[PDB]
Design a protein around this ligand. Structure first.
Ligand SMILES: CCCCCCCCCCCCCCC(=O)O
Ligand SMILES: CCCCCCCCCCCCCCC(=O)O
Ligand SMILES: [Ca+2]
Ligand SMILES: [Ca+2]
Lengths: 8, 841, 841, 8
């Protein structure tokens, strides 16, 4: 999936 | 109308600003309770009906808690359920690290758990250790934290994917060095079941695994396990039993090997990865069965590894991917949801254990075993469907108890009939097949198809049932109802619904409007929990009791029982966006979000930042709290940027036709929708300065950020592209072929969709293009950026670049995220927002 | 004094400017004639005394030419020698590509050639083909281009490093898949001599090579061959002969393997390299000998591979590196120049062929062969020297004909006695050694040392003889003179000198002052060619005839004979810099170059760009034409930048003590010298604006550019660091240990010298730090940049980055260089020079 | 050698 992960 | 120019802070001052505003968002960034389970007390004298178990974060680690559900409540007051810790205190590897990328797990601790109802046995992994505890079975209910009991091992490496045998809670299985092992938690016996992989060998000459989901299945189909316990034990005359494990065996020998930079940069080395790039070989797959003979007192007598009577390619013609698998509730058949390469044909196929025979290299003894299996034993394609768009795999599949011998009854969901995902009750006839194995021919395409006796639509309309990311059904087999999540009231809100599956008609909404809900329904179908929020209010978690009116069991009502997690409350810094919409020239209503600049001055126009994803399987615009993950859009608004987000055609929760708009054409239509919505806002709101528009996104969002600057440099002044796809030939089979087809069948779409082939079309002015990328990215390889740069250099074009050397397709190290936010904010200031930015042209 | 702000051009306009100015520098960037050789006509009736042969570029490829040297000349006119092509017209691999990096070859075509005087046979590689032609031997002299004759082969892969056997010009040797082969160019017989490497295997399990110089020796010691033909054949009683090849056999099994990104970025792969990082294992080395028995009519009878009687580590105690090797002129001894690990001990060691015995795994037959070799046969350390700074390896070593049995006479050069490189005539006594192999002990350190009978200083003073990059001696054994290049007249100019080696006294300069000269002396010692230039005039190549006065053969004079290459002439765009100097507080005169801004306005101060290298083995500041390679410093001057270059302490051509200033302390002293020289200029020239100083350099220059910004942010506004060393532990043994020692013996120097360990010390303001790096760099690995970035991100520091994805430690693709120049010029404009740059703070 | 190569 072209889905990045960043929650901060 | 004169231009507003943002306050021009230094790098150190912006770091301070961002740090201060991050300081009051530690408590916000905390996991809500999840993975709920209801267990009945069965105690007439006691005050509690149920105990609920769940995973939650009380900066703490994720762990198991329980709460007590009372039989009665004081309906004047609001009951806050206290969180009791289930576990006492305790005394990453590469495969954990990668699984956490594949599952998109941002949090730390216990990720999941198994439970055996009949014994109360919990099984869960916590760090390297596999652990078990007992609660809520024959042994009763604890009033204090339980000690986790380590499952001891002689295995040197990390044990992955532990599962309790439902047939016997003394037994567990797990993966170790890509082979299936089992372990008995009472006797401490440990046994390797498959001998397919060698831990000591190099991956270049050792590409076979068992019980494991390969990269494409974890990344593109959300399947993380490759083995499944049979739920029932077969008794032997001796007094013991036979336990069974169906598993997938993979051979990745012909799959291409790429090299990804090793995290330990000091080594100046690179790890090997089996990566099936679009148009190249996926792994060679098959089903296998491990037959495990246990004696009267729980010791292993023997293990017989078994294979399909004929090859996988013969028995399951045209199948590339094992999307899902499992067993029927009595263990008579293994089931599987199978896809073809194009992902335009789905099949649900029952597989009997009698299709499997022991592995035998001796050709004489093998031929006796083949003929001993009857010709009546065959694969049973209980359901088959096709589409001209694509099959979206989901987790909805419920099999009812087998009432008649030659029939199977089940609920499935599909978009293939109407173009929206709906529930269908299906009954399929298990005929003896026309194909006979003795004759010595090969089976024709349709020879394993089952006739459809009954196919009733349970739901219908211009709205979808949800089957992904935790959304599923819950079937009440007593009252003959099915609970499900859907978009019926609004595409901006998820809601819980209920409907009959026998005489389907009225669909009753069980959740309150003005919130989006993610729900869990009790196995007993007398409670549900909702994790819910809206644009203004942070997420809450509440328990609701279900009941029927006296006169009609079909009708279902709900009543607030208790609060599990209270809302943190509206944060004073955070001003939420307004949801807008507009009728597109494409014929669809398109939704968006608008962050107005804070302290809006009249007679002044502000610089605009378009945050974008704009890709399949995601909806950014809905009625949920955006003050956690998208908190920095508010920060941009607080400094004087207009912030816009638009869900263009291709995004999800609007049916298959809407999603199918960019089939074969990714990158070609999305910016039209974005510009249309952006122009709608500018004519309506005169504070939007169209001369200073920036665009920013990650992954597909970064892809579109590059497409925006390439296609529409007239609109977009700056583009900040995060981990973008610049070349579709680099991306994998499962994703690319689904949306774009095979490269040879879409030469122009692949060309037009690849910005690296069109470097000449980028702007010749600098300070307009910023590329961001994690250096260690194994999903969207850094070569996307490196090759784009190569062609930009050849074309004489300027660029800016920032690498995050410790990151993959994610930002996990705090310092990386802080630097990213700081650099982005400073970039926007210097090249879009500020007064110096205007002079710079 | 008000600030001058440079004209602010767009990216497209700067591209135009740079392209226009590059358009009149195609003819400038062309290789001068080189690799000269003189051959006598021996024709009393003919008008020519000699024919000269040379490699030259007439955008053309490098090829062989000849010119005719007349017996007499018209001394009124100037003779221009016409270039006759030697060759007719014809009908990269990884190892060619890497060799061209190691040798620093920028040009295309024939890189070198062999010649056998007695037959006239040329041997040379041209592309993949090895070729030969005949001229100037018994067969006479051609008056038209000769057809190159391909040496045919059955070898599938590229043949590297071809050499003619001096003993027999029918035979050649070459390297193929890291093994030595031989081929007869008449009979076409082809034979593999060593069986040490397998072409089909992986390099991870196949680390042995023969006849090959490994990475560190090519990169750090300028040795590119690992095998050496014996110059004489031993006759056999049968009527045939024995040819010999000494060779180095290397085992790189224990050398660390790093991964460098593969040039084909689409593969997303990485190549394996044996890279000995500082403080880790170098290859295990030894000497071997191939004994090749040929019959009466040139067919190979047999090949006997031979090894040292005792191990290399026993016979050559303390030796890490075989720096050089060869044979004595009669072939009686093989010689070798050997270094210890610290590179503070050199040894010249003679090695007899009798030290080698046949390879035999049979322990019985081996023990007979060991005892058959006499104890008198032993290694002869003919010279040994030490230093507290380091041994600079050079190519000067001349062995005279052996006059007496127990003596050898030779010229060597060294800095160890006085601290400046001078020639010394040495005579060593070849005693029978105290160590006896029969006794069964091991030899003590001094047991192979030869007594020094005579050691006469041929040259002396506060100036050096040149022995690198083509600079060498030429010995006239008749007149007993030695020709050499030196710095005696000036450190800014190289000159040709001559002196007696018997009664050394007067040193006569044969070249004219006001130019720097690179020279080739004829083997007959009656001509020399000078390639010469100065700061104002482009390079010329001229022939000079040598002669003595009637009264004194010792004294040598010269006379201009002819021009080989005429000067292109002063280019109108190009204004050269002025050489300056200043007395440093360190006690040394330090030289520099100053490019004044073009059209210098009075009462105005200009932004300054300090171009820097500042590392060992290089001198940037001298009296040579800088309008080819450093043409863009003039371009910077033409737009209004002051450009400064300073040769700080540690640079070369100033003796060993001056070079030794930064031993153990690299990065700590260089910027003091640079700032001192920069402050000298500012007090003298008021047009230097010290508030706007930029610094830029490549490799060591990039290293110091980072050190400048880190240490002295008060001085330097911007730093542009090209392919920098950010971490000394990443760099190799040969270089790092020479200048910085072992990491454990210099913990603070390694720390202070590594900018990546000191990320916190960089500026918190952006637009001051620009990193540039070739992505495919196998010398200074990209990890230097990637790890620096990692720590800058952790420290919250800003950076700019540009990658050149097609480049290694060099810029070869034209588009890369064009983009680099364009981006650099634009960066300097926006962040140092222009009016907007001043506002930006 | 920490010596880059670029000739233009
Ligand atoms: C200072 C400005 C920072 C902007 C914050 C942007 C948040 C980035 C979130 C990354 C993920 C986006 C894709 C969302 C999805 O596909 O689920
Ligand atoms: C537009 C400005 C371009 C500046 C040109 C700089 C030339 C770079 C030369 C690279 C090599 C320097 C090291 C010299 C050496 O060590 O021999
Ligand atoms: Ca996934
Ligand atoms: Ca070299």
């Amino acid at each position: 999936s072209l889905r990045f992960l960043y929650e901060g | 109308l004169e231009p507003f120019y943002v306050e021009r802070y230094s790098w150190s001052q912006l770091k301070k600003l961002l740090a201060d505003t991050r300081k009051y968002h530690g408590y916000m960034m905390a996991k809500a309770p999840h993975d709920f389970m209801f267990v009945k007390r069965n105690d007439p004298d006691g005050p509690h009906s149920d105990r609920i178990y769940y995973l939650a974060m009380s900066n703490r680690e994720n762990t198991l808690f329980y709460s007590e559900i009372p039989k009665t409540i004081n309906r004047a007051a609001v009951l806050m359920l206290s969180w009791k810790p289930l576990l006492d205190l305790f005394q990453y590897s590469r495969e954990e690290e990668l699984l956490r990328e594949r599952k998109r797990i941002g949090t730390v601790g216990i990720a999941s758990y198994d439970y055996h109802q009949g014994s109360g046995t919990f099984l869960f992994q916590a760090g390297s250790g596999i652990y078990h505890v007992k609660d809520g079975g024959p042994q009763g209910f604890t009033q204090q934290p339980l000690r986790p009991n380590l499952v001891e091992t002689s295995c040197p490496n990390i044990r992955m994917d532990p599962k309790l045998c439902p047939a016997d809670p003394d037994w567990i299985a797990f993966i170790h060095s890509n082979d299936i092992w089992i372990s008995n938690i009472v006797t401490r016996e440990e046994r390797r079941l498959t001998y397919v992989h060698n831990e000591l060998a190099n991956m270049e000459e050792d590409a076979r695994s068992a019980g494991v989901a390969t990269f494409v299945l974890q990344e593109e189909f959300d399947r993380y396990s490759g083995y499944w316990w049979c739920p029932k034990a077969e008794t032997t005359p001796s007094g013991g039993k036979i336990l069974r494990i169906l598993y997938e065996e993979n051979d990745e020998s012909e799959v291409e090997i790429i090299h990804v930079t090793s995290p330990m940069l000091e080594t100046r080395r690179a790890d090997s990865f089996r990566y099936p790039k679009t148009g190249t070989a996926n792994p060679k797959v098959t089903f296998k069965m491990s037959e495990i003979m246990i004696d009267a007192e729980g010791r292993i007598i023997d293990v017989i590894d078994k294979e399909l009577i004929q090859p996988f390619e013969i028995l399951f013609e045209g199948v590339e991917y094992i999307a899902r698998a499992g067993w029927t509730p009595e263990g008579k058949y293994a089931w599987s949801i199978l896809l073809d390469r194009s992902q335009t044909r789905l099949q649900i196929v029952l597989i009997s254990p009698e299709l499997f025979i022991p592995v035998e290299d001796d050709v004489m003894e093998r031929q006796r075993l083949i003929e001993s299996v009857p010709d009546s034993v065959t694969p049973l394609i209980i359901y088959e469907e096709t589409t001209d768009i694509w099959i979206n795999i989901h987790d909805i599949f419920h099999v009812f108890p087998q009432s008649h011998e030659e029939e199977i009854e089940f609920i499935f969901a599909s978009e293939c009939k109407t173009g929206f995902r709906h529930l269908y009750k299906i009954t399929s006839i298990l005929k003896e097949s026309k194909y006979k194995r003795s004759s010595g021919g090969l089976p024709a395409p349709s020879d394993f198809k089952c006739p459809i006796k009954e196919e009733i639509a349970i739901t219908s309309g211009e709205w979808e049932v949800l089957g992904r990311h935790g959304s599923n059904i819950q079937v009440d087999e007593v009252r003959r109802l099915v609970y499900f999540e859907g978009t019926k009231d609004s595409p901006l809100e998820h809601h819980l619904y209920v409907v009959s599956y026998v005489n389907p008609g009225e669909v009753t909404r069980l959740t309150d409007r003005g919130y989006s809900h993610s729900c869990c329904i009790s196995q007993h179908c007398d409670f549900f929990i909702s994790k819910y929020s809206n644009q203004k209010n942070p997420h809450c978690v509440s328990l609701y009791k279900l009941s029927s009116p006296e006169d009609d069991p079909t009708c279902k009502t709900k009543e607030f029982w208790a609060t599990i997690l209270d809302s943190a409350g509206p944060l004073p810094d955070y001003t939420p966006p307004e949801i807008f919409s507009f009728e597109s020239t494409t014929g669809f209503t398109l939704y968006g979000m608008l962050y107005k600049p804070h302290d809006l001055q009249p007679g002044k126009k502000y610089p605009t930042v378009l945050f974008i994803y704009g890709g399949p399987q995601v909806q950014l615009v809905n009625n949920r709290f955006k003050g956690v993950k998208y908190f920095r859009l508010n920060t941009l608004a607080s400094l004087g940027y207009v912030v816009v987000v638009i869900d263009n055609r291709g995004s999800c929760h609007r049916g298959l036709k809407f999603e199918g708009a960019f089939k074969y054409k990714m990158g070609q239509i999305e910016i039209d929708d974005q510009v249309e919505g952006l122009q709608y806002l500018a004519s309506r709101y005169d504070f939007i300065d169209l001369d200073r528009v920036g665009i920013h996104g990650w992954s597909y969002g970064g892809y579109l950020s590059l497409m925006a600057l390439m296609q529409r440099s007239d609109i977009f002044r700056v583009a900040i592209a995060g981990a973008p796809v610049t070349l579709w030939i680099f991306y994998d089979t499962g994703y690319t072929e689904r949306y774009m087809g095979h490269p040879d069948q879409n030469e122009q779409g692949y060309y037009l969709g690849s910005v690296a082939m069109q470097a000449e079309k980028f702007p010749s002015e600098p300070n307009r293009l910023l590329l961001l990328h994690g250096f260690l990215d194994e999903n969207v390889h850094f070569a996307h950026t490196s090759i784009l740069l190569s062609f930009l250099v050849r074309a004489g074009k300027p660029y800016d670049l920032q690498i995050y050397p410790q990151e993959r397709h994610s930002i996990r190290v705090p310092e990386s995220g802080e630097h990213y936010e700081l650099h982005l904010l400073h970039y926007l200031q210097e090249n879009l927002g500020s007064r110096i930015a205007a002079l710079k042209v």
